[model samples]
Target: RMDEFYTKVYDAVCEIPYGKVSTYGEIARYVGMPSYARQVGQAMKHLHPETHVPWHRVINSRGTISKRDISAGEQRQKDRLEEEGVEIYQTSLGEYKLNLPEYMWKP
Candidate 1:
């Protein structure tokens, strides 16, 4: 299980509704600590493979999923997001990104 503060971050991430997504800075801001954006990402890094937390619903401030912690990890997130109806598009430079303004969930 994630520790206290990381759990706090995870719990905040839980607020991201299905079919929607949010950024690390957004989670930190909503968690009452906009300064904790980087820390928020750290929390995500600690998420266990068995957790029910919707980590896929959290993306980077650039509207992109963060790099994979393991092989196919990024693709797994993309698949889940697609199944949720959040379309993932690729950039000309080969990075996949989301349409943050439309997919973003402020609450």
Candidate 2:
């Protein structure tokens, strides 16, 4: 069984609606861990595929998908987001940045 921290993070993540995205910090904040963005990312990293978490709806604060050790994993995340109609683009910094103002979940 997961601890309360992980459970809170997962539940918060699951609340993000489809075709929308939330930042790691936002999820942490929603779960009452105001500055625990990295912990939220850690939760996502360790999330199991069998879980009902909508893992693709979370991104970094910069509106970019965080880099994983495997490039395909990063690409897969982007693909899943795009499949849901989120527009992704390359930034001047060469990062795949999303249009946060447009796609950010307001709830």
**Model 2: lDDT to the true structure:** 0.82
Name the runs in model 2 displaced over 4 angstroms. 66-70
TM-score against native, each model: 0.88, 0.84
Which regions of candidate 1 deviate over 4 angstroms? 66-70
Q: For each predicted model, how many residue pairs clash, with residues at least 3 apart or on different chains?
A: 0, 0
**Alpha-carbon error at 8 in model 2, in Å?**
1.0
Q: Which residue pairs overlap in candidate 1's backbone? A: none
* RMSD after CA superposition, every candidate: 2.8, 2.6
**Candidate 2 C-alpha lDDT tens digits along 1-107:** 24778888888888999999998888887877888888888889898765778898888777888443427667778888999999888866666778887988887
- What overall lDDT, based on C-alpha atoms, would model 1 receive against the true structure? 0.83
Best by lDDT: 1
User: Which candidate ranks first by TM-score, i.e. highest?
Assistant: 1
lDDT of 1 by residue, 1-107 (tens): 33677989988888899999988888989988888788888999888866899999988878876443424768878889999998888776667788899999967
Question: Residue 51 CA error for candidate 2 (Å)?
Answer: 3.7
